[PDB]
Amino acid sequence: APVRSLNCTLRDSQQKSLVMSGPYELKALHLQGQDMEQQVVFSMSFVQGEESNDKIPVALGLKEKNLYLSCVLKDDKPTLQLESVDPKNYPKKKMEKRFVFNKIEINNKLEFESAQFPNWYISTSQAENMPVFLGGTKGGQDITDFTMQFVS
Numbered sequence: 351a352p353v354r355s356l357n358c359t360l361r362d363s364q365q366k367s368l369v370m371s372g373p374y375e376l377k378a379l380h381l382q383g384q385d386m387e388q389q390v391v392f393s394m395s396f397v398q399g400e401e402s403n404d405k406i407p408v409a410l411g412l413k414e415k416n417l418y419l420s421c422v423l424k425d426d427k428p429t430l431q432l433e434s435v436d437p438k439n440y441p442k443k444k445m446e447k448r449f450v451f452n453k454i455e456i457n458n459k460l461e462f463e464s465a466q467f468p469n470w471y472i473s474t475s476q477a478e479n480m481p482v483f484l485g486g487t488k489g490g491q492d493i494t495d496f497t498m499q500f501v502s
């Protein structure tokens with residue numbers, strides 16, 4: 351089955367934009383209007399024909415597909431990383447499981463659950479300029495829902 355890609359930006363439910371913070375990390379903060387160009391453009395890839403399903407596996411690439419968001423164990427704990435890939439072979443028709451998230455649309459917002467680590471989600475802190483991380487709790491102070499804005 352063929353793969354479809356969309357370019358987009360992500361904002362958490364409290365309107366914090368996502369930006370790079372060096373080569374290995376994303377941070378979330380409320381950006382000023384003139385700094386809006388700092389927000390990361392993602393290439394969200396998924397399999398064509400699943401638009402009506404409740405859970406849609408997605409891969410999130412960035413840097414013109416040079417990096418992908420990846421879920422790996424670090425110190426025996428699910429961790430979000432930015433993994434380097436050869437952009438020529440991406441996105442794959444069969445993406446490696448560590449790059450896959452179930453995109454679930456709840457109350458008009460988006461939630462990204464790790465396919466490799468169930469009940470672990472892409473998360474942000476309430477505080478400004480803190481790293482984007484994989485979190486195991488929902489409903490607490492950590493934010494697990496986002497809105498998406500299409501670039502192309």
Ligand SMILES: Cc1ccc2c(c1)NC(=O)[C@@]2(c1cn[nH]c1)c1cc(-c2ccc(C(=O)O)cc2C(=O)O)ccc1O
Pocket residue numbers: 353395396397407408409441442443444445446447450452465
């Ligand atoms: C671009 C793109 C994204 C995502 C995928 C592809 C390409 N190609 C795929 O095959 C892909 C897919 C299958 N259906 N739709 C897309 C896929 C799905 C899973 C997956 C997701 C959720 C769960 C769960 O437990 O909820 C289990 C698994 C698993 O299969 O272990 C793992 C690897 C994988 O690559």
